Amino acid sequence: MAFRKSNVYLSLVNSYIIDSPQPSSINYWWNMGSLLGLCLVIQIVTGIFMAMHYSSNIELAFSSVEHIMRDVHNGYILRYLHANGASFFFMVMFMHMAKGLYYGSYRSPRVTLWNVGVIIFILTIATAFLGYCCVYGQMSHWGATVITNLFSAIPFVGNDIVSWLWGGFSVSNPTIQRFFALHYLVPFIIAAMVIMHLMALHIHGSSNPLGITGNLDRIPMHSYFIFKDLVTVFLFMLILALFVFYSPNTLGHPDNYIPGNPLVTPASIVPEWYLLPFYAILRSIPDKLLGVITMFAAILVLLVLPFTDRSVVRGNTFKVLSKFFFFIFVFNFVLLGQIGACHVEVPYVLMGQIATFIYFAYFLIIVPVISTIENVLFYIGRVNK
Amino acid sequence: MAFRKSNVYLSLVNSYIIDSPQPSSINYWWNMGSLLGLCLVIQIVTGIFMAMHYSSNIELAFSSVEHIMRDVHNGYILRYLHANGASFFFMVMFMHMAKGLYYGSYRSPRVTLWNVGVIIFILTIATAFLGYCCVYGQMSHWGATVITNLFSAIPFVGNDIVSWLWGGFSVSNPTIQRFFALHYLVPFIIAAMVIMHLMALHIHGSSNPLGITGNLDRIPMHSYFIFKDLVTVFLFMLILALFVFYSPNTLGHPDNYIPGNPLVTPASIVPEWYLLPFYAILRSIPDKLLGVITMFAAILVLLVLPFTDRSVVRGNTFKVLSKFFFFIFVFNFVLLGQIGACHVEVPYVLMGQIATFIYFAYFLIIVPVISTIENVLFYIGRVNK
Amino acid sequence: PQSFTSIARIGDYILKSPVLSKLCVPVANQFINLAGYKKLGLKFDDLIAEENPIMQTALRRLPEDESYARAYRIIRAHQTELTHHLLPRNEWIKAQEDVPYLLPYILEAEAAAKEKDELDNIEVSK
Amino acid sequence: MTAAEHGLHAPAYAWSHNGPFETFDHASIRRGYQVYREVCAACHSLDRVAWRTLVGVSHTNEEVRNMAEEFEYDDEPDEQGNPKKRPGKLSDYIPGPYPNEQAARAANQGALPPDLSLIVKARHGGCDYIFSLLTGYPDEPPAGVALPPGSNYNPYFPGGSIAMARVLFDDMVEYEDGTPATTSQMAKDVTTFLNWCAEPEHDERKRLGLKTVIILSSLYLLSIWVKKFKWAGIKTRKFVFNPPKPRK
Amino acid sequence: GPPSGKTYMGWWGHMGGPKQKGITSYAVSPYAQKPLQGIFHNAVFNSFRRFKSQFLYVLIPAGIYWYWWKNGNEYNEFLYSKAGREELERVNV
Amino acid sequence: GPPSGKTYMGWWGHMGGPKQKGITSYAVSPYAQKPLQGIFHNAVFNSFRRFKSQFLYVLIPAGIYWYWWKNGNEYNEFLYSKAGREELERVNV
Amino acid sequence: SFSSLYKTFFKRNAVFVGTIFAGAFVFQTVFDTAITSWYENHNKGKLWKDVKARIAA
Numbered sequence A, B: 001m002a003f004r005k006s007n008v009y010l011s012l013v014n015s016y017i018i019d020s021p022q023p024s025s026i027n028y029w030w031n032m033g034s035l036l037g038l039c040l041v042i043q044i045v046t047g048i049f050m051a052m053h054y055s056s057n058i059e060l061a062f063s064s065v066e067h068i069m070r071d072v073h074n075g076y077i078l079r080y081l082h083a084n085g086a087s088f089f090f091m092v093m094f095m096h097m098a099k100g101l102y103y104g105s106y107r108s109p110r111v112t113l114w115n116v117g118v119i120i121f122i123l124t125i126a127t128a129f130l131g132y133c134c135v136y137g138q139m140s141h142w143g144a145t146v147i148t149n150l151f152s153a154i155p156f157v158g159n160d161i162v163s164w165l166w167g168g169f170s171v172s173n174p175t176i177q178r179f180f181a182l183h184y185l186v187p188f189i190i191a192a193m194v195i196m197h198l199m200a201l202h203i204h205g206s207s208n209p210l211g212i213t214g215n216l217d218r219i220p221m222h223s224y225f226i227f228k229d230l231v232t233v234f235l236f237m238l239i240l241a242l243f244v245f246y247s248p249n250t251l252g253h254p255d256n257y258i259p260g261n262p263l264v265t266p267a268s269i270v271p272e273w274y275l276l277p278f279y280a281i282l283r284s285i286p287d288k289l290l291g292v293i294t295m296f297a298a299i300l301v302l303l304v305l306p307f308t309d310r311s312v313v314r315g316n317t318f319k320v321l322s323k324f325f326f327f328i329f330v331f332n333f334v335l336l337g338q339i340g341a342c343h344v345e346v347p348y349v350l351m352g353q354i355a356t357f358i359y360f361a362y363f364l365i366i367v368p369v370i371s372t373i374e375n376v377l378f379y380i381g382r383v384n385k
Numbered sequence C: 001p002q003s004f005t006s007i008a009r010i011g012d013y014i015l016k017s018p019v020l021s022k023l024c025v026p027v028a029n030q031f032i033n034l035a036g037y038k039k040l041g042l043k044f045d046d047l048i049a050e051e052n053p054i055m056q057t058a059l060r061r062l063p064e065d066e067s068y069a070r071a072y073r074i075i076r077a078h079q080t081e082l083t084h085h086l087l088p089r090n091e092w093i094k095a096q097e098d099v100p101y102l103l104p105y106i107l108e109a110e111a112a113a114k115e116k117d118e119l120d121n122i123e124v125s126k
Numbered sequence D: 001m002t003a004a005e006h007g008l009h010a011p012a013y014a015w016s017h018n019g020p021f022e023t024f025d026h027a028s029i030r031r032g033y034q035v036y037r038e039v040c041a042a043c044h045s046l047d048r049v050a051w052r053t054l055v056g057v058s059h060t061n062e063e064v065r066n067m068a069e070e071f072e073y074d075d076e077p078d079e080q081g082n083p084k085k086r087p088g089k090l091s092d093y094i095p096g097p098y099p100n101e102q103a104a105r106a107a108n109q110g111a112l113p114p115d116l117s118l119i120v121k122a123r124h125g126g127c128d129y130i131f132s133l134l135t136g137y138p139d140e141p142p143a144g145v146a147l148p149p150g151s152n153y154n155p156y157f158p159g160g161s162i163a164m165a166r167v168l169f170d171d172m173v174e175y176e177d178g179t180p181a182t183t184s185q186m187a188k189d190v191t192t193f194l195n196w197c198a199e200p201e202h203d204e205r206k207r208l209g210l211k212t213v214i215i216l217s218s219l220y221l222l223s224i225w226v227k228k229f230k231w232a233g234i235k236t237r238k239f240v241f242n243p244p245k246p247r248k
Numbered sequence E, F: 001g002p003p004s005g006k007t008y009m010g011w012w013g014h015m016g017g018p019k020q021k022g023i024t025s026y027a028v029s030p031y032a033q034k035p036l037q038g039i040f041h042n043a044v045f046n047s048f049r050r051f052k053s054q055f056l057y058v059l060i061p062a063g064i065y066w067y068w069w070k071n072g073n074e075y076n077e078f079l080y081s082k083a084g085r086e087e088l089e090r091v092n093v
Numbered sequence G: 001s002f003s004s005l006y007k008t009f010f011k012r013n014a015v016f017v018g019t020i021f022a023g024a025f026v027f028q029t030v031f032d033t034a035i036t037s038w039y040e041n042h043n044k045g046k047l048w049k050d051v052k053a054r055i056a057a
């Protein structure tokens, strides 16, 4: 018990920041998760500054956003940082999920961590939509109405629930005000559940790229991993500076920059780039309520992903067929996003339906059978007697 | 080991809420702290629900609460509960500080608790003063001007900080926007430091009315002290509901329900009741910076009490006359507040200096001499040679 | 999670079937030696996950020599992968040195645990 | 989709304000203001930006105040409550002939004029999009297409017909030089002015971005060196395995 | 402070891994080294070797899906060009 | 979780109190008790005793401060009731 | 070449923070001035400094 570890306030930091036994085989993929957390808190703080200098009334919402754009020092920078930070936040979330899935980090030691992350994703896509609603342009409230009509597909009741949620049959001050308030509030639940995520992580430790035990050797995080985090966040900040200064409004779409006027919709209406695959999974299935439930099934299939992979060897580095099919999966995901970007006509619908079919078939069928084949091949090849 | 202690979230809940070896001589005074915590939580919740239908515009702030009263369903409930809960929070907070002082809760194992509590006190001085400045009533602008101009006496920097606070060179939209933003945000800082306070307490435990070691008999928190907390909070809810529903104009002052207009205003301008003790003391010594430095002294005297007295026996229950002087001090506190309520005039102006002198003298000179005298009286009484 | 007894059953089914085994054994060993763990100086038993309690029970019965060699191989693999390098064809595990030293303990523990959990929840039906 | 109304992409032209180390050519923004105000006055609104940003980048000190004095801005009523008329201020917004919006839809013989303060980013493409839209339309529609009576044609713009009156005839601009009277010069002037109005921070943004990329590049290289430095003692440690003596 | 739950890994001194003997390490201070002794050899030879190793699993799905997307694009472009009045009617049935 | 620093108390089983031996406790299963029968009498007696042990501590300070406030107020009526015209001068000068 | 004159400067800690912060401030100021000057002299005519003389007669 030195002063650093005897004092409880400093002991809490000591167990997390000053000293924590991470393995020595960490690649550049876990500092990506730390970068995810840090860009999340950057988004939170710039949101606090916006809420300090933002007004949500319909008579002033567009007025407030253009005033923070133009009539304040260092104002437009805040909006550009918000847009680029949201885009990078979803990109790094996808990278985090890909790293978790490829390296077999959903297995028994951290199943609880896996479900915590899954529910984080489930509600953060919601909060992203809610923030998208707060713009109140010619397409933001448009997509908000789209989502309200989608949610109106609950069976056995259609009017009371949608009227209660959407503040009556019309849109007025309470609707947009409550939408802004809830986009302000949900990230606090994000922060709390991320605190839970880090608690579970610290309890159960971290995995390795080798897919093997890491207790053999360990090193403190401070003075070894803090500078790796520093260099990766410096690279991220350089890239973010490049996309915020030279070409700020590129990741977003040139549709939000219209004053509030839900009279004539623009010719080109597409969802933000982090939602196209789910728009595709909705468009493929020819049913409204069944389309909604299959979107939710696609989102929640990660919950049933564990206790379905019966590969004895953790990870996917030493197995060739599994990683080949994993690459097929990720390219199918990007193809689904790309096809959702374009319009719906022949023959895009057929191959989109095929893509959704191979997606769900992948998850529910192919990994168990190919993993069983991998295990039996592992057994048979080594034994020659 | 049971699953209740196995799961990390459940283990933390059990060890911090369900199971806690609290002492067996606990009175209602200790449940008053949990009651105050519940009051703080409900205050945050009702404030959040109030701000959802609130407008941050300068001209749409008083109009916002008017619209809440006259248009939204059960609008009066939220604001009445907010105001009365704030006042009750402050009264119960004074009660909690007094209970900590009288029972000798400031001894060596709880100096950290005393420091975090006094820090909460320091911030709580202004976290509601600025909330009252937000409403922009008929003395709210005056309170805002007082708080923004108290700091102008600092040498070599008197204009830069007040200009930063003003959002310019006067009081305008930036002032009210910043006021609302900080009154919203800094209660989250209160939440942070009260989590720290509870963490320190759970590390070190509570105390006993007797003043002796309580490590002999203990009972678990659940099913024993939960009922005491429940009955205390039921009584608090009953009295609070009766006041809010039947006598709305009792705790608050009928001065803020008038639009801000420095044109016609009465002379009956006096801050809210909980300011009076730390307001009469400011009008005793006749200078500008002297008032600020003596506020600093009056808030640091609560901090100097540890390692100041010489009472080897913890508490005042078993001391012949020290409790009498403590009662003198508490009645002097009440009388100082009441005389600060009255305007400045002879002999009340003359009473101010003597009241402040006694208020400081109990803290400075009374406690050590009275403790030493009590100790020597005990020593001469106990022995005969 | 997948029982090793089923793996042994499928293995013995394949090994004594002439045509299917003759078709599937050369591709099997070619897949094994293209997997890549041979180069890193890893035996196969060092790769299978060691977390769930049955694997811990199997590990606890290993003679000390095998555990020491396994620990050294894990440490060397971590060090080698940290530098993204590969030691030349001197540490490479030979073709016939990748014998399973941990299979019999796994099979015995699997059988014991399976029959324990089967007879624990049993009925008295004829 | 079908390219008939999807809109063929315009080629990437070369401008003065498309690059990493550039500024606005605001020696012509003083000319873009004139070209906008001479013809587009009673056509659109643009009423989103103020005059405090029109000083120091397009007009120096005085002509802005002359313009403010030139127009009446409907001052507050006097003590009798009667309406009056007053000169404009230097912190007001660019006015428009329509009271708020009513006089626009009545005279356009059709739709409403979109607010030009954001049209630069309101459409895909960007700076070259408006140039292509205002240049590529012929004077005669493609063969076989009979447009509605009173409507023009534009192949670049998705939609193939607009309520735009093709007021782009030359030979009546002539500021003080020989530059005007050709469509290219006025088109470049209007597109640069519209880009500036949509983003009146390009120079400052690029300067701050250059400073930021320089400082972050330096910091990134610094972190590279230090990470390769203090990890040198852990990336080179070697292990040697000596089998223990055979006795438990 | 009650002990926490049973977990395979813990704090220093009780990693939980197998007890080992016969392992010897050999570190040396970063001060007595060249911090970038072999950056070029790494970034050329090892980078190319890793790229060649991973060049058997990544490009094939990308190529096949690129062909699928391009074939769909060609079909779409050919459908709405001198065939929309005779071929597009017999595909939307 | 991990062990903490210096503390004056622990958890159940190892709290850290003084070692003691020879104490016997009891209980009567509060279900079979019929707890309260003389609650009003118990409250009366407890209130009587509590008031008996604290005579002066509440009566004296409140009385002396009431007397002080009364003295101030009565000086005010000697001054501030149609009488300041001939004493405010000597107060302020 | 690292003589005792430079060796002595690498032992102060209590006062080195203030002077290092002042040096950082000076460096950032001179860097800002240099970048502003280079952005000025990389583009002539377009900027508003010389349009005053261009319109001058």
Ligand SMILES: CCCCCCCCCCCCCCCCCC(=O)O[C@@H](COC(=O)CCCCCCCCCCCCCCC)COP(=O)(O)OC[C@H](O)CO
Residues within 6 Å of the ligand: A028, A235, C082, C083, C084, D224, D228, D235, E039, E042, E043
């Ligand atoms: C035409 C592009 C010019 C770019 C100019 C700016 C960037 C300069 C980068 C440094 C000069 C190039 C040197 C040659 C390539 C070095 C690549 C490499 O692997 O070297 C080190 C790379 O150093 C790093 O740590 C790089 C971190 C990479 C972060 C994640 C990848 C992002 C992409 C990196 C390349 C592009 C960077 C700029 C992107 C705009 C070693 O890796 P390590 O330090 O992690 O050690 C691992 C092991 O010991 C191998 O020897």
Ligand code: HEM
Residues within 6 Å of the ligand: A040, A043, A044, A046, A047, A048, A050, A051, A054, A065, A079, A082, A083, A085, A086, A089, A128, A131, A132, A134, A135, A183, A184, A187, A252, A256
């Ligand atoms: C990680 C969390 C968040 C994400 C992904 C996110 C995402 C977004 C997105 C995509 C927009 C649209 C803005 C644009 O298109 O220009 C937006 C706008 C906005 N967000 Fe968030 N947001 C997050 C958190 C917050 C928080 C905490 C606040 C706090 C107040 C906030 C306040 C706002 C405001 C006020 C706007 C509108 C301002 C504008 O249009 O420029 N956001 N957000």
Ligand code: HEM
Residues within 6 Å of the ligand: A029, A030, A031, A032, A033, A034, A036, A037, A040, A093, A096, A097, A100, A105, A106, A110, A113, A114, A116, A117, A118, A120, A121, A194, A197, A201, A205, A206, A207, A208
């Ligand atoms: C969105 C906010 C998140 C934050 C701040 C966060 C943070 C972290 C951190 C710090 C780690 C330790 C390793 C690393 O630093 O990457 C980690 C690991 C992990 N996270 Fe998250 N995470 C988030 C979301 C998610 C989500 C949505 C998932 C769901 C798929 C997830 C799944 C995992 C997994 C499986 C690991 C294991 C990595 C290892 O083996 O240690 N995380 N996360």
Ligand code: HEM
Residues within 6 Å of the ligand: B040, B043, B044, B047, B048, B049, B050, B051, B054, B061, B065, B082, B083, B086, B089, B127, B128, B131, B132, B134, B135, B183, B184, B187, B252, B256, B272
């Ligand atoms: C827990 C600490 C708080 C205290 C002591 C407090 C105190 C007060 C008081 C006294 C008033 C009315 C002024 C008067 O009648 O005297 C008020 C108003 C208000 N408070 Fe708080 N408040 C607190 C926290 C919050 C929080 C967390 C919110 C969150 C949104 C909030 C939102 C409001 C609103 C919307 C009003 C209406 C009038 C205004 O704009 O100030 N308050 N608060």
Ligand code: HEM
Residues within 6 Å of the ligand: B030, B031, B033, B034, B036, B037, B040, B093, B096, B097, B100, B103, B105, B106, B110, B113, B114, B115, B116, B117, B118, B119, B120, B121, B194, B197, B198, B201, B205, B206, B207, B208
């Ligand atoms: C107003 C915000 C506060 C909250 C929510 C709060 C919360 C609590 C809670 C829950 C307890 C546990 C009570 C018990 O042991 O049963 C407690 C105890 C205590 N608090 Fe606070 N507290 C606050 C303010 C303060 C302040 C200002 C001080 C004085 C500087 C203080 C000093 C103490 C002490 C000395 C104890 C121990 C009481 C005992 O053991 O006898 N607290 N507080």
Ligand code: HEM
Residues within 6 Å of the ligand: D039, D040, D041, D042, D043, D044, D107, D108, D110, D111, D112, D113, D114, D119, D123, D130, D162, D163, D164, D165, D167, D190
């Ligand atoms: C003086 C020269 C003019 C210029 C530079 C100009 C510029 C523009 C631009 C950029 C647009 C939108 C193009 C796009 O879709 O991005 C537009 C649309 C429009 N303009 Fe003009 N315009 C001019 C003259 C006029 C005139 C004289 C009128 C008639 C009074 C007019 C009425 C309209 C209308 C109604 C639209 C909207 C068409 C629609 O909604 O379909 N414009 N103009």
Ligand SMILES: COc1c(O)c(C)c(C/C=C(\C)CC/C=C(\C)CC/C=C(/C)CC/C=C(\C)CC/C=C(\C)CCC=C(C)C)c(O)c1OC
Residues within 6 Å of the ligand: A016, A017, A020, A022, A030, A031, A034, A037, A038, A041, A044, A045, A191, A198, A201, A202, A206, A221, A225, A229
């Ligand atoms: C797996 O190994 C680890 C690891 O174990 C840990 C712990 C970390 C550390 C984890 C993180 C850094 C991510 C944690 C993320 C958070 C804690 C998010 C913080 C969220 C917040 C909301 C921050 C709270 C701060 C505030 C509320 C204060 C902000 C308010 C301000 C500044 C008010 C400003 C107003 C004025 C007037 C100044 C790692 O990065 C890591 O990988 C190496």
Ligand SMILES: COc1c(O)c(C)c(C/C=C(\C)CC/C=C(\C)CC/C=C(\C)CC/C=C(\C)CC/C=C(/C)CCC=C(C)C)c(O)c1OC
Residues within 6 Å of the ligand: B016, B017, B018, B020, B033, B034, B037, B038, B041, B044, B048, B191, B198, B201, B202, B221
């Ligand atoms: C040490 O022994 C103890 C002890 O163990 C405990 C527990 C207590 C009791 C302590 C407390 C009750 C204080 C704890 C309070 C907090 C930790 C506050 C934290 C709460 C918040 C920050 C806010 C709560 C958040 C929510 C309720 C989220 C839900 C709110 C909204 C608006 C979402 C719902 C809206 C919709 C539309 C669904 C003691 O007093 C005590 O000493 C005797």
